[PDB]
Amino acid sequence: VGSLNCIVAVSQNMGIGKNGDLPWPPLRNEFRYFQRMTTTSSVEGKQNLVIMGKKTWFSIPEKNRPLKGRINLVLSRELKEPPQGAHFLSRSLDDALKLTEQPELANKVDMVWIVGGSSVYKEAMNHPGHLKLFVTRIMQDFESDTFFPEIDLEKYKLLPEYPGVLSDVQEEKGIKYKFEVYEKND
Template identity: 60%
Template sequence: MARILNGIVAMCPNLGIGKDGNLPWHPTRLNEEFKYFRKMTATASVEGKQNVVIMGRKTWFSIPEKNRPLNNRINIVLSRQLKDPPHGAHHLAPDFISALRLINTELSERADQVWVIGGSSLYKELMESQGIRRLFVTQVLKQFPCDTFFPELSTDDYNLLPSFPGVPQGLQEENGIQYKFEVYESIVH
């Protein structure tokens, strides 16, 4: 059975997801939003297995060193330049397709859910790939300066789900910043 692939992202109203290698609202922290990210990406649904997080090289290096690798998850970094996994990463793959192949072969006994955590081009590949895709989007309801953006989300390709297990409903607020959690699922054409 083909895996459902998940993407998880927090974005501004203009689809901005980053600024200068940080989250757009940096240095403000959204601790509850971060706990949600950790819970979603680290909680395996199958006993004895671990979730996989796939990220680009820039996303890897944007994570504070003390937090790398993301614990309780198999960390795969994508890079065409690097020859070896960066210090702390579990695996290196040259591209998204190679990462998925690694998960379905060498890691198949250990891997549970697959989460794409950034950046932009990797999200775009995920969204354009075949099969069932879920996008866990935190809509930050305040605009911040951004230099990195999430791909346009087409309602022809994705439906907003009314609710999803484990995803808080309604408006959230931290440090004067309001946000809401949304889950989109790909429409199989």
């Protein structure tokens, strides 16, 4: 099992969702960006695992579930089996990570990508260890009802470049945004 990572797109006021969808209109190249980063594995003959909360899962369009070419794991204490289309079900972040260390997944999983929502991100970001955050900064305020947790810059270093990630400002549908990579190790 290799790297543990978070990926998120967030607005200036730290919003990541509204009524079970994104706070901004669909940004095609940003979704493609998300798809490329979570799918691509450096170790041949392996796949990345994506871990999400239940409400994240149901937010993804049915036709795109499971996220293709990745192992899909959903977090829930209420569910008793994985949702239709999901691959795995765990009851805690600890459990999900324990699981990747079982003999089955052990040698099938490269990168693990936490893709949301707020409470999964919170726990991961505040747990000791080597962790990257891939952060798309939507450069506007947008009305939101769910929020990215605080990034402690004493611990998370913004990297000045990262291979496969554009540094310059992007824009689609008149919304400007940029990509960022943070790393801590503690």
